[PDB]
Design a protein around this ligand. Structure first.
Ligand code: K
Length: 169
């Protein structure tokens, strides 16, 4: 079966600009993007409203269906995943280069509802190897300084270092 990896749902982002990387170690059937929290992702990623995904196998963008977008990865390529939760846009880079849809737009997805926010997600097909890097050690990100850093995006790990919550009785 397919393996779905997702950030812990308690770390979903509802504002700000966020970045993570996905290394396609193999070059086959994998998808990577942003998932709504607490939803069940038993379907193919982004076939419904539960996620927004880049399919680097077939060069498609997936949200409530598919359209051509970007280009396919080669083994060892790194996808950068960016979400601006205030402008309601998502962008992807492949080895630092911004991917475009057929209209020439860099907005992979736009005008989406914030809802309960988003967490990084990826799906790996049979025998596929793909690694999400949230950048806890920012120096392990490969393309953040090329595209992401100057644009004001924060590594997703910045939102996951806190492990304590507080409330008033
Ligand atoms: K943590």
């Amino acid at each position: 079966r397919f393996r779905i990896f997702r950030a812990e749902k308690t770390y979903a982002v509802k504002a700000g600009r966020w970045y993570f990387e996905f290394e396609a170690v193999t070059a086959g059937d994998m998808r990577v993007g942003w998932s709504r929290p607490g939803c069940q992702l038993d379907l193919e990623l982004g076939s419904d409203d539960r996620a927004f995904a880049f399919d680097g196998f077939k060069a498609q963008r997936w949200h409530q269906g598919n359209e051509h977008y970007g280009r396919s990865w080669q083994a060892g390529d790194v996808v950068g995943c960016m979400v601006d939760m205030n402008e309601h846009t998502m962008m992807f880079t492949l080895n630092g280069e911004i991917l475009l849809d057929d209209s020439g737009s860099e907005l992979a997805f736009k005008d989406f509802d914030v809802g309960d926010g988003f967490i990084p997600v990826c799906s790996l097909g049979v025998a596929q190897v793909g690694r999400m890097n949230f950048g806890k050690d920012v120096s392990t990100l490969k393309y953040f300084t090329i595209c992401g850093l100057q644009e004001g995006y924060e590594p997703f790990a910045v939102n996951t270092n806190r492990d304590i919550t507080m409330w008033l009785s």
